[PDB]
Structures are given as C-alpha cells and as structure tokens.
C-alpha cells in the first residue's frame, strides 16, 4: 500500500501499545504479543520504527533479563543507518551489557548482530558503515575472547558469524571484504578442537575463493597462509586420530578423511595448491 497516513497511524498505535504493555508488566501475554510482533516482522522484509523507538528508550533501563528473547530478536530488524548515530544511543548500552553479562548472552548478541548484518546486506542488495560495524563487532569479539579465558563456546559463534560475513562479494555483488583480527586467527588456528580446525579450513577456503573471484589485505592473507602451511604439513588436536591409528599404512590421511573432514579435503585440494593431488 505504501500509504503515508496509515504509517503514522500504525506507528502511534504500536508505540503507545508497547508503552502501556511495558508499564503494566512491572508477563506471558506481553511475551505472546511481542512474539506475534516478531512473526509479523519476519514478513514485510523490513523493520518497524515503533519497536525501534521503544528499544532505544528501554535499552538503557534494560536489565538484560526481563524479555531478553523478545528484545534480542528486534535488534535483528533495525533499519540501515550510518554507524555514527546508532553507536552513541544504541551500541553503547549493548557493549555495557556485553562486557558484563553471561557468555551465553554474548553468543546471543553475536547471533543478533550477525542476523542484523544479514538483513542489512539483503536490504542493500554506505560500505563505510558496514566496515565500521564489522570492526566494532570484531573488537568486541577479541575482547570477549580474552575475557572468558578463551572459551571455544563463544569462538564457535565468532567463526560462524565470520563465515556469514565471508560471502559478501559472491552473495550481494559488493566489492568489500573485511579480515578478522589476528588474535582470533591465532587463537582458533592452533586451538585444541578439531571442529575449530575444520571451520578455519573452510573459512580460509572461502576467503581465497572470494579473493580470486575479484593491498595490505592480500599481504595479510599470504602471511596467514604461510602461517597455517607451517602449522600444517603433528597437530595435537589430531592425536586422538593417531591413537585410533595405533589401535588399528604410511598414508593415514584417508582414515582422517573417512572420519568426516570433508572441509579439509576442500581446503587442501582447492586452496593451498602446494599438493593438489590427495
């Protein structure tokens, strides 16, 4: 319809409804109403403004646990704006909660921001704003990665977010690629978890594919490639497999491959090119 008067009519309606529901709460009916609002927000492929204003007003007062499930799904649908007005009003309290709340809440807000990034790329398909947003979320990422004694639970969300990022050029035809900080690079690459190794191999393969699809970025990418090729062909994370290799053959990489490291085949066959043959 794209009608101006109905926009204001629904704006005032939903804004005053949100105010009265919030003041009356201090709960199940409020949660159900917000769930219906979120379901409607999934449609129309665009965010509302009454919810945005309500969240702006209530975020500083927000404890972080009243309706966390409801709040964190609205930040996903936030209209595109320059990364110079939202940070003073919105992302400051977001960081306030993030630096002090639970690690699971950190994974939660990471999911919310990656969904926001997905929505913004979908709407756009300017670049300085998303670049600054990526830098800010990366700073939060490295700070929290230090914060939680290097817990891999948050590292999984970091890496999943970065996989969602790594496809900008091939998913939205945007010639912009941002590189993750070296702290996360070194923490994850030489980590003690095998699935971490898997998804790092996947992410550098995707980065190489994006790079070859289209100055300092290339130098850092080459430095990282040298770093992992020095780290790879051993790895402590594979000692498990080695023990199995002792329980059960000069070429043992096939057993690792049958164990389910298909991302490793992709990385070592189509990215490094030092030994293209398996």
């Amino acid at each position: 319809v794209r009608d101006e008067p109905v926009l204001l009519r629904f704006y005032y309606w939903l804004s005053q409804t949100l105010q009265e529901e919030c003041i009356w709460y201090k709960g199940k009916e409020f949660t159900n109403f917000l769930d219906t609002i979120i379901r409607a927000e999934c449609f129309l492929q665009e965010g509302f403004y009454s919810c945005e204003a309500f969240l702006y007003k209530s975020l500083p007062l927000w404890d972080g646990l009243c309706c966390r499930s409801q709040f964190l799904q609205l930040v996903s649908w936030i209209p595109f704006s320059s990364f110079s007005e939202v940070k003073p009003l919105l992302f400051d309290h977001l960081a306030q909660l993030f630096f002090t709340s639970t690690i699971y809440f950190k994974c939660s807000v990471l999911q919310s921001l990656k969904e926001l990034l997905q929505n913004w790329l979908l709407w756009l398909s300017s670049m300085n704003s998303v670049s600054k947003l990526i830098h800010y979320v990366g700073w939060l990422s490295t700070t929290a990665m230090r914060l939680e004694s290097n817990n891999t639970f948050l590292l999984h969300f970091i890496l999943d977010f970065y996989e969602k990022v790594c496809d900008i050029y091939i998913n939205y035809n945007l010639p912009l690629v941002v590189l993750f900080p070296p702290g996360i690079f070194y923490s994850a690459l030489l980590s003690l978890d095998t699935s971490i190794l898997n998804q790092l191999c996947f992410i550098m393969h995707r980065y190489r594919k994006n790079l070859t699809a289209a100055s300092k970025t290339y130098q850092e990418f080459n430095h990282y490639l040298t770093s992992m090729v020095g780290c790879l062909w051993h790895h402590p994370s594979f000692l498990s497999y080695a023990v199995s290799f002792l329980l059960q053959w000069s070429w043992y990489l096939d057993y690792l491959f049958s164990q389910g490291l298909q991302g490793l085949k992709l990385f070592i066959r189509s990215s490094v090119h030092h030994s293209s043959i398996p």
Binding site: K26, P60, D63, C66, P88, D92, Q96, F99, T100, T143
Partner: protein
C-alpha cells in the same frame, strides 16, 4: 581522610567492594544479593553513608567504589557530590562506578536523568541503570557487580581498570 587505592596490600585472592548511599535497607539487600553466591575469591562488602570514610587502621584495600544514586531525591545527589571530594583522582580511573535506581519509573524520578548522565560523563566513569526493588533486576545487577569486581581486581589476566573504562566509555 582522602581514600587511596594504593595504600595497603590485599589478601590472598581477596576482593573488596564499597557501597555509598543513603538508603541503608537498599544497601543491605544489595549486599545480600552480592553474597548470595561466592566465587573462588573471597569477597568483602563495605557500606557507608558518606565520605570521608571513617578512620580504621585495619582497613584492607578497597578495590572498587560504587555510588548508588536515587533519582527520587536530590538529597542522595548532594550526598554524592559532597562525598566525591574525599577521594583521589586515581579512583576515577575505572575504580569508580555509578548505579542509578528507580530510573524506569519516569514518574517517580525526582531529578532528571540528564543531570546524572552529565555528572557521569564529566568524570568519565561507567554509568549503570538498575532497579534494586525488583528481585530479578537486583540479581542481574548482582552478577554484573561481581564480575566487574573480578575484572577490576586483576583476577583475570589481560585487562585493567583503564581497559574496562575504555570499554565502558560513552560516546558523549
């Protein structure tokens, strides 16, 4: 007696907190929420009504300063700015925090929140909003304060008070 963060030595894995305000019952309930759970490090809680702090030769290190402010009364404000003159500037480097209570009820907020926002931004100190009356909000603020204490006390390797200040800094 101007309080100094670098007077004495702390105990073996010991942390201390200070709460300064007017409402004694709210402070007691907040300390109860503080000590509902205890981490690996032992925790000491101090409550006071004004500054300078009463003299005590047996005072351990006070690694964190928290001022509770009620927007319901200007008296709590006048208390805060009068007490603020009995602490060195070194505490202001991330060892001080402001917690505002009752901010959600805009009708009950006597002084406008813009005033306390300006006060906090003037001294470049973290500002937190919570409602002590609500048990859930109080508990959430409880782990929040416990963990910010853990950060500022140096228990976790990697950051310091000025680091968290650069983290919690407001744009304007």
């Amino acid at each position: 007696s101007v309080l100094r963060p670098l007077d004495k030595l702390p105990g073996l894995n010991t942390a201390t907190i200070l709460l300064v305000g007017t409402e004694d019952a709210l402070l007691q309930q907040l300390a109860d929420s503080m000590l509902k759970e205890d981490c690996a490090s032992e925790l000491k809680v101090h409550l006071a009504k004004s500054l300078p702090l009463p003299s005590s030769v047996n005072r351990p290190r006070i690694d964190l300063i928290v001022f509770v402010v009620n927007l319901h009364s200007k008296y709590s404000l006048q208390n805060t700015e009068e007490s603020l003159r009995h602490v060195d500037a070194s505490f202001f480097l991330g060892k001080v925090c402001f917690l505002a209570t009752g901010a959600g009820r805009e009708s009950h907020c006597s002084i406008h929140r813009h005033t306390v926002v300006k006060l906090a931004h003037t001294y470049q100190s973290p500002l937190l909003y919570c409602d002590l009356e609500v048990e859930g909000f109080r508990a959430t603020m409880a782990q929040r304060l416990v963990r910010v204490l853990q950060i500022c006390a140096g228990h976790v390797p990697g950051v310091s008070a000025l680091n968290l200040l650069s983290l919690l800094r407001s744009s304007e």
